[PDB]
Curated annotation (Swiss-Prot), chain B:
Tissue note: Ubiquitously expressed.
Highest taxon listed in the record's lineage: Eukaryota
Recorded family membership: Belongs to the ISY1 family.
Subcellular location: Nucleus
Coiled coil: 25-44
Function: Regulates the processing of the mir-60 microRNA (miRNA), which in turn negatively regulates the expression of the transcription factor zip-10. Does not affect the splicing of zip-10.
Name of the molecule in the record: Protein isy-1
Consequence of gene loss (knockout): RNAi-mediated knockdown results in up-regulation of the transcription factor zip-10 and its downstream target asp-17.
Curated annotation (Swiss-Prot), chain F:
Residue ranges that the Swiss-Prot or TrEMBL entry lists as coiled coil: 1-41
Phenotype of null mutants: RNAi-mediated knockdown results in increased sensitivity to the heavy metal arsenite.
Full protein name: Pre-mRNA-splicing factor syf-2
Family affiliation: Belongs to the SYF2 family.
Portion of the full-length sequence here: 19 to 59 of 234
Organism: Caenorhabditis elegans
Subunit organization: May be part of a spliceosome complex.
Membrane spanning residue stretches: none
């Protein structure tokens, strides 16, 4: 994805392609990069990702596509597509096995009974 | 001493012979030794 | 062994192991040695030395962890835990393709938390572990994290020097690939590498100064170097002032905070943002 | 005669002498870590009352031994039970009724035909 | 070296029993078991003299801590 | 392509410069670390 940003998007994505992936794939890093990018350019990047229909050349169709997929909608979808998944086993191994008082009683979380 | 609490069925090798895959490897090294002693004895 | 008293087995084991270790029988010798170590646990240091010589690196590592988990004051070869653990990283980090059983990265970061004398070395050890594994993008992540987590200049100078040398290696390899290939898309991958490499050099001043601002971010002088490092990036100069002037505590300040307030207001005033300049004088008071 | 500690005599008996080993599903969950450490090996599971055992506690007896290779060495699994009699006694209403923890593995496999 | 101190045997062990236990590692020509006059029993220890020190070494190394009647008998160099 | 070799030569030069400059900052810290905390007072 950075290799493609170097070819295609270059001037608009200078931070994305030039950093390391962990500097680039966190939820904050994606929202910063694509939140600051111009709306038509975030769409082109989503278009590269095959998230959205081809933007084409007709300015009217373009305006409908930008209207159908607004800026914050793209950034959230690009973020969901690109962000680092958490490895659930690392979070799982961090937990204890015994429940504590905060877990044995969890009153507002247990209407289950 | 304190080794006696550590000796067990594993130490005496009751729990180490269900596998048996060692024997083909041992056979390979074993035959090279047989030829090696034969060659050393050949000049005697 | 079954036939004789257990107390006579030392007269047998020294032959049994001595016979086995004279031959290229690693799979058999492993099973016999782990039996022997139940009666003579002192021999585990010699078992490790055997395993290394037979390239049983994955087993040599496991037995080293047992020697380290046995937190002896000194081992039966005169090595303390801080020596035995240093062996474990030398054996681990240089053998990534073979060390398959241990969680290597979890060992080396756990060292850094514990061996604060040599943090700058261990980050290269962890990164070099991935470089030998050819996981070049994990290698970058370790270096780029290290530069963000290292907390002395002495340790940063090692990591950054290593990371710059690592980048130059990859560019050198990739550059030759284009010089042989001539392919136009490979050359685009080469120039991408140059942007990456050149950018890391450009960060040098910023990263060095940032390390000092984790030693003592009451050092208002280093916030003024931080501002000058962004000279011409008018926005980031203002942003790091707004970081600076809240991060410093005046009571132990080195230099004094009044240089920041007047400096920031002067920066606005020099650029004609006099309302913001006044605003910073107001917040200053 | 070689193993004179009372513990070792039971460990030899458990791993080498006995051919039929009998254990409640509850106790199989407790003793797993010991049995795996002892190199306990078994080739056949027979379960009775399999419709009353929890899905979880039915599964654990499959894994009371290390795999000797890239694959397991279990040869037979016999489940004897009756899914038309009562389920395992899951007693929280939600975890019983919503998450269907009241389904034993015997009942689940019968529903799988 | 040729003189051994023998210790740790049970009350059942007579001098011929030690003779039967020690000639396994060389020629034994005498054994002595000092007896405690107050109890009328031996003190659990005895001396062995060998004709060769090498035999006494093959008798310390291979009788020391050896089991006799299920007890670990101790065999050692008389100081 | 010679363009790349000329560019790469300057970056190595720049790396070597940064190699030295880092060492200057390290030796400076030693005096400051040697200097006591009371020195500011």
């Amino acid at each position: 994805l950075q290799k493609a940003a170097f070819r295609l998007f270059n001037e608009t994505m200078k931070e994305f392609y030039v950093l390391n992936v962990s500097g680039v794939d966190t939820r904050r890093a994606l929202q910063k990069q694509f939140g600051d990018m111009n709306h038509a350019e975030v769409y082109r990047f989503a278009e590269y990702l095959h998230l959205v229909p081809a933007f084409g050349e007709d300015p009217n169709h373009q305006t409908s596509l930008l209207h159908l997929y607004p800026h914050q909608h793209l950034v959230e979808t690009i973020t969901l597509h690109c962000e680092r998944r958490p490895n659930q086993l690392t979070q799982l191994n961090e937990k204890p096995l015994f429940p504590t008082e905060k877990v044995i009683w969890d009153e507002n979380i247990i209407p289950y009974e | 001493a304190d080794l006696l609490r550590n000796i067990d069925a594993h130490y005496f090798g009751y729990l180490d012979d269900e596998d048996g895959r060692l024997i083909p490897l041992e056979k390979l090294i074993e035959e090279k030794n047989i030829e090696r002693i034969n060659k050393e004895f050949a000049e005697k | 062994l079954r036939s004789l008293p257990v107390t006579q087995h030392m007269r047998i084991w020294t032959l049994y192991i001595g016979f086995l270790t004279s031959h290229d029988l690693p799979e058999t010798t492993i099973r016999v040695y782990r039996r022997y170590l139940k009666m003579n646990p002192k021999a585990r240091e010699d078992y490790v030395e055997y395993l290394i010589e037979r390239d049983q690196i994955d087993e040599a590592a496991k037995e080293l962890t047992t020697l380290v988990n046995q937190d002896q004051n000194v081992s039966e070869k005169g090595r303390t835990a801080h020596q035995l653990w240093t062996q474990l990283c030398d054996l681990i980090s240089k053998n990534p393709v073979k060390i398959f059983s241990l969680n290597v990265d979890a060992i080396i970061r756990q060292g850094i938390y514990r061996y604060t004398d040599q943090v700058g070395f261990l980050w290269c050890s962890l990164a070099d572990y991935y470089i030998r594994s050819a996981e070049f993008e994990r290698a970058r992540d370790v270096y780029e994290e290290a530069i963000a987590k290292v907390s002395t200049v002495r340790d940063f100078a090692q990591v950054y020097d290593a990371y710059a040398a690592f980048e130059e290696r990859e560019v050198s390899i990739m550059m030759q690939e284009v010089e042989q290939s001539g392919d136009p898309e490979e050359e685009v991958d080469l120039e991408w590498m140059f942007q990456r490499y050149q950018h890391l050099m450009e960060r040098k001043n910023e990263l060095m100064n940032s390390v000092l601002l984790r030693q003592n971010p009451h050092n208002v002088g280093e916030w003024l170097n931080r501002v000058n490092i962004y000279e011409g990036n008018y926005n980031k100069q203002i942003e790091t002032f707004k970081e600076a002037v809240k991060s410093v505590n005046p009571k132990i300040q080195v230099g004094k905070v009044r240089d920041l307030w007047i400096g920031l207001a002067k920066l606005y005033e020099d650029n004609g943002d006099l309302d913001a300049a006044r605003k910073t004088f107001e917040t200053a008071v | 005669e070689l193993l004179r500690n009372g513990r070792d005599r039971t460990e030899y008996l458990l791993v080498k002498e006995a051919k039929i080993i009998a254990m409640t599903c509850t106790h199989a969950a407790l003793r797993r870590n010991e049995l795996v450490k002892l190199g306990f090996r078994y080739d056949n599971i027979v379960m009775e009352e399999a419709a009353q055992i929890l899905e979880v506690e039915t599964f654990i007896p499959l894994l009371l031994q290390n795999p000797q290779d890239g694959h397991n060495r279990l040869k037979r699994w016999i489940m004897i039970g009756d899914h038309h009699q009562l389920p395992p006694v899951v007693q929280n209403q939600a975890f019983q009724k919503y998450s269907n923890m009241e389904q034993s593995l015997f009942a689940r496999l019968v529903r799988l035909s | 070296k040729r003189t051994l101190y023998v210790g740790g045997f049970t009350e059942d062990v007579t001098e011929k029993v030690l003779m039967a236990a020690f000639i396994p590692f060389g020629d034994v020509v005498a054994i002595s078991i000092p007896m405690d006059y107050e109890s009328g029993k031996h003190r659990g220890f005895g001396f062995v003299e060998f004709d060769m020190a090498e035999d006494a070494a093959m008798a310390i190394d291979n009788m020391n801590e050896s089991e006799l009647f299920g007890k670990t008998i101790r065999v050692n160099f008389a100081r | 392509m010679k363009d790349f070799n000329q560019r790469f030569r300057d970056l190595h030069k720049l790396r070597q410069r940064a190699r030295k400059e880092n060492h200057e900052q390290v030796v400076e810290e030693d005096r400051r670390s040697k200097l006591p905390k009371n020195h500011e007072a």
